[PDB]
């Protein structure tokens, strides 16, 4: 019903779009279809091109000097729109036909087909001293009136609309996570065991994650403390493959397990942005201009192993740690940690409308 339009600064060029969020169904992305309303009496033997660009901005091993944090272009597409010189008989979107009928004979359609294995819109949380465009993956539709593509893109006759590539939680739940550990301590038989396991494979934002930790320390060592953490990983293959990591939820429990005894408990954690608004580089969901978005959703890679091209791959894991105190030769402070990691999926369920209903002050 409703469409999005944005005219050029001088008003002699408008771009109409149906959606600003284009869902990726893994197999195929939704096509970025739309129309451009031009003024042939103003072009004066000049063409109109529409470009779609996926841009990656990040600094390779970011430090006090950010050298590589300028820009990158993971995908660029071009379409000549006003003069139908290619005579492209590609089928028109019903939205395109309706907009053409409404606008008249000067409205010409454009349509893109974003290839799969492309990054979703991910925003890296800026630091308190990070001045500039936020790092991450960003899509944009740009239409301009120029004689040729190589000509300078004048500011006045150009329209830049930001769009988002998004994913949603798959309708088929995965197997319930479960991990184990059996650490045989030095000079001690009957080793310690850990059997942490979640309850769901897929979680939604704002929902609690229940961890079913079951310890059985059949050894002669005492578990001093139990640390439970939810961490976010963000692989960034911009200049070199570099996996990052950041906890988002933590729950340090003081429960202790005596030697030759078991311990069963269920914990509960919920990642949210209120207590993480200061972790620089935290992967957030794609923003339009500056509004608040939740923690970034898990990246659903196509076919598991298709191609590792550049982009940010967001994943989440639950870490279950058992610290074991040790004295004697030590000073009762050298703790051996037994760790378990459980991967889970953090996505949005499939919606019925455009996500942005949030009231703005």
């Amino acid at each position, epitope marked *: 019903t*409703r469409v999005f339009k944005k005219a050029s600064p001088n008003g002699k060029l408008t771009v109409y779009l149906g959606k600003r969020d284009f869902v990726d169904h893994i197999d195929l992305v939704d096509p970025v279809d739309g129309v451009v309303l031009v003024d042939p009496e103003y072009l004066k033997e000049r063409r109109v091109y529409v470009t779609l660009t996926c841009a990656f901005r990040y600094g390779r091993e970011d430090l006090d000097v950010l050298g590589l944090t300028f820009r990158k272009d993971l995908f660029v597409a071009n379409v000549q729109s006003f003069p139908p010189a290619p005579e492209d008989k590609k089928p028109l979107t019903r939205l395109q036909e309706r907009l053409i009928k409404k606008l008249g004979e000067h409205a010409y359609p454009f349509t893109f087909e974003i290839p799969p294995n492309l990054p979703c819109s991910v925003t890296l949380q800026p630091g308190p001293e990070d001045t500039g465009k936020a790092c991450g993956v960003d899509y944009e539709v740009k239409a301009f009136c120029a004689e040729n593509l190589e000509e300078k893109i004048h500011k006045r006759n150009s329209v830049r609309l930001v769009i988002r590539k998004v994913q949603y939680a798959p309708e088929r739940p995965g197997p319930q996570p479960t991990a184990e550990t059996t650490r045989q301590f030095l000079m001690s038989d009957k080793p310690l065991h850990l059997e942490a396991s979640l309850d769901k494979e897929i979680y*939604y*934002h*704002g*929902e*609690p994650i229940s961890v079913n930790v079951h310890v059985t320390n059949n050894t002669n060592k005492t578990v001093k403390k139990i640390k439970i953490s939810v961490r976010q990983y963000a692989d960034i293959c911009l200049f070199n493959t570099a996996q990052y990591k950041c906890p988002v939820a933590m729950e340090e429990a003081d429960d202790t397990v005596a030697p030759s005894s078991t311990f069963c408990k269920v914990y509960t954690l*919920t990642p*949210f*942005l*209120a*207590n993480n*608004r200061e972790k620089r580089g935290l992967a957030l969901d794609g923003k339009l201009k500056h509004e*608040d978005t*939740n923690l970034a959703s898990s990246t659903l890679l196509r076919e598991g192993a298709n191609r590792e091209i550049l982009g940010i791959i967001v994943s989440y894991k639950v870490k279950v740690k058992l610290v074991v105190s040790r004295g004697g030769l030590l000073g009762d402070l050298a703790s051996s940690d037994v760790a378990v990691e459980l991967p889970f999926t953090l996505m*949005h369920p499939k*919606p*019925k*409308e455009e*996500p*942005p*209903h*949030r*009231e*703005v*002050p």
Partner: antibody
Amino acid sequence: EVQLVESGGGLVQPGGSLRLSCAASGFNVYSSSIHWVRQAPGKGLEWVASISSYYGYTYYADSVKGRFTISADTSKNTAYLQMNSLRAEDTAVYYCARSRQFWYSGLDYWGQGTLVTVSS
Amino acid sequence: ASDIQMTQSPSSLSASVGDRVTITCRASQSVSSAVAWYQQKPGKAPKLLIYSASSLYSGVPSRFSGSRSGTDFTLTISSLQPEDFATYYCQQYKYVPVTFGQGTKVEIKR
């Protein structure tokens, strides 16, 4: 089952204070927003306050901003509305309403409401 | 927007069982389609009818239907049943001061 239960609403004096408790059940404070909507006797609805609890927002009306404060207790899944400096124009039935945190702001769940009478 | 006023046109509405009635409201400025409709029986909490100015909330009878033309919004009831006697409210939620309408009382006429 989803239900919001109110408590702590009763007769007070013009200058007193109460603390309304909304025992939210069936959902979580992080995946939903909690709102306070009051209805004066014989009048229309008026939104008073709201708390996000995911982004850490608290919002207040232009008439209750200084005096009303909203908070949530995550462990007990209970939202709290501490009233202060209550005047005569605060006699109303206060409902705690729930909204989706992600991609909806429309109050699909309401409580029964607590009649808060503020008179000397 | 500093503050948005929702103006419900029918303050009082008299109808009969099986009749078709429409309740409309006009926003002060463009709230986009961020509009919801609520039904309140005497002595109870409001019930959400529709949202997004058209989307029919799950469980609501199909008689209720909303639409948006411009800055104005409309809630229509087709073949209203006797239990449609209530007060209907419109809400905008495009801005933090979410504003409600004054309400429309649909009374049964005879």
